[PDB]
Each structure stands twice: as C-alpha cells, then as structure tokens.
Design a protein around this ligand. Structure first.
Ligand code: 5UQ
Ligand code: AKG
Ligand code: CL
Ligand code: FE2
Length: 280
C-alpha cells in the first residue's frame, strides 16, 4: 500500500536517476523522489508551514493569516481556508520580495531554480525541440513562468478528507513533506507516498499532461490526495505554471510532433477550472 518510487538527484548533467529504465518509469508514473541539496536550508519554510495560520500573536510568521486575497488583487493568493481539512497561504513570485519574509523569498528562489533544472531534463527527454521550450512551458523552461510558493496546514479537528483527490495545474510541483498522508493513485489503486525528509516529492501537473498528450510517451499528471489527518500536518510546495498574471497570460499548449504548439486554453483559466473541480 506504499508506492515504490524512483529516487533522483540533480547532478552535473541534469536529473540523474539510477539508470535509463528508472528514469523512464519515474516519468511514466508521473511522480518520483528528488534528493534535497545538502546546502539547502528548509527550516524557515518548515516553520512558516507550522505558523502561517495562527495569527499575529505567533512570531515570526503567524501574521500571514491576516493577508486575504483582497490584499493582492488576485483571488488565488493569500490565506485560504478550504472545504477540506487544508488551509493554505499561497503567493506568486511577483509578490515574494515585497510580501514574504526575506528568508522565505530566498527559499522560493532556490526552489524556482531547482525546478527549472528538473523541467528542462523532462522537456529534453520528451523530444520537444529546444526553441519551442519557452512558449511550451509558458516561461518555465527559463525563469519566466508563474511560481507559487504555497504553505499547507491540515486542521485535524475538521471531519474532512485532508485534501481531495486532484491533479496540480502546472508543469512541475516540488513538494516538501515530512509526515505521512500523501497518497497517489497509480493504476487505479491508492498508495501512500513514502516519507523521506531528505527528499522532495516531484510530480507533474495538468499542463505537463496536456503538453505531452500527443507525444509518443505521454506524461501524466498524477492523481493524488491527502488522507484524513487525526493529528495536525503541514507541508509546502513550489508550483511552476505557465505565466498566469491577470492581463499577461501565456497560454497552455499541446505539442503536435513534427508540427508545433497548438493553444489549448489559458493558464489562469486552467487554474480556476481545476480549483473549482478539486473542491466542488
Ligand atoms: C497555481 C497554484 C494554485 C492557485 O489556486 C498552485 N497550483 C496547484 O495546482 C495547487 C492547487 C491546490 C491543491 O493546492 C490549492 O488548494 N497549489 C498551488 O499553489
Ligand atoms: O500536503 C501535501 O502533501 C500535498 C499538498 C498538495 O497536494 C497541494 O497543495 O497541491
Ligand atoms: Cl481555522
Ligand atoms: Fe497537489
């Protein structure tokens, strides 16, 4: 009932699995483990995930509870109480420097560059021509995408599932979890994702699935969920999406082999539709 996931590392040539078969399975499963660089400090992010929901009486991060979507002119952002056990703080990179604590913005920058390197290995392995990467990824093949650094707290007193089954919206999710509860549906069976605090969980979102749907090896956005938590749980994730600013939306594309990119929908449109289905 626990998934047997491939483990990878970022090395001198990019994303290194144990062998080519291991990489192929990992990309086919749509989820794998990525070793956390030894120099990367996650302790401030872990603390933010434990505090952000607690209010201005709890230092240094409880005050972010007070920052609702209105403060950002973007309904996606700020503090959100979900219908599941989950409550969240979500912030897109254009606000990190102004709004996040400086050490949290730094964490977001590290993860953006790490995710950038991961995505480029995946795009190369898909055989998409390099000059199409920027438009295909809505800027994420460089550092031009939309990036959400999102903190999660599961309220165990709520008699809900932790987080309903869903696919992420974008291309790459880098997930930091230190406690059980994350499950994946591979081959129509729910399985627990092993907990390894020395690794990130990496998966693909809907944009990756759309982008590669006409390729010889389509990559899937893995269905996942968080089971009902009897004790509190927290985590955070870095989400890479096609640039989805209000007014500057880069679009979602499917790659047609030998032809080029065909536009499928808007990036914000996909995020809004997906969030709608996840919860209602
Ligand atoms: C783009 C942004 C979501 C903005 O609403 C990004 N993309 C995702 O797919 C998930 C969505 C849900 C599970 O987390 C939120 O409940 N989280 C993110 O931060
Ligand atoms: O908390 C987790 O482990 C998963 C969070 C998640 O899947 C999400 O926010 O999209
Ligand atoms: Cl609450
Ligand atoms: Fe998710």
């Amino acid at each position: 009932r626990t998934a047997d996931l491939e483990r990878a590392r970022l090395g001198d040539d990019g994303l290194d699995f144990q062998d080519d078969a291991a990489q192929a399975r990992a990309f086919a499963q749509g989820v794998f483990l990525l070793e956390i660089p030894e120099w990367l400090d996650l302790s401030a992010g872990d603390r933010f995930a434990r505090q952000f929901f607690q209010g201005t009486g709890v230092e240094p991060y409880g005050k972010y509870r007070d920052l609702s979507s209105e403060h950002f002119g973007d309904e996606l952002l700020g503090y959100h109480s979900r219908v599941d056990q989950l409550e969240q703080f979500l912030l897109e990179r254009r606000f990190w420097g102004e709004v996040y604590p400086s050490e949290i913005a730094t964490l977001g920058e590290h993860l953006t560059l790490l995710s950038h390197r991961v995505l480029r290995s995946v795009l190369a392995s898909a055989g998409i021509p390099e000059e199409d990467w920027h438009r295909a990824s809505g800027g994420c093949s460089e550092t031009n995408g939309s990036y959400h650094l999102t903190f999660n707290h599961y309220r165990s007193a709520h008699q809900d599932i932790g987080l309903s089954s869903h696919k992420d919206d974008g291309f790459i999710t880098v997930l930091r979890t230190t406690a059980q509860g994350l499950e994946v549906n591979r081959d129509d069976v729910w399985e627990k994702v092993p907990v390894d605090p020395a690794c990130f969980v990496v998966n693909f979102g809907l944009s990756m699935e759309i982008l590669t749907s006409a390729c010889v090896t389509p990559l899937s956005a893995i269905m996942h969920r968080v089971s009902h938590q009897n004790f509190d749980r927290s985590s955070f994730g870095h989400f890479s999406s096609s640039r989805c600013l209000p007014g500057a939306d880069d679009g979602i594309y499917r790659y047609l082999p030998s032809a080029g990119l065909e536009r499928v929908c808007g990036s914000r449109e996909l995020i809004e539709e997906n969030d709608h289905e996840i919860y209602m």
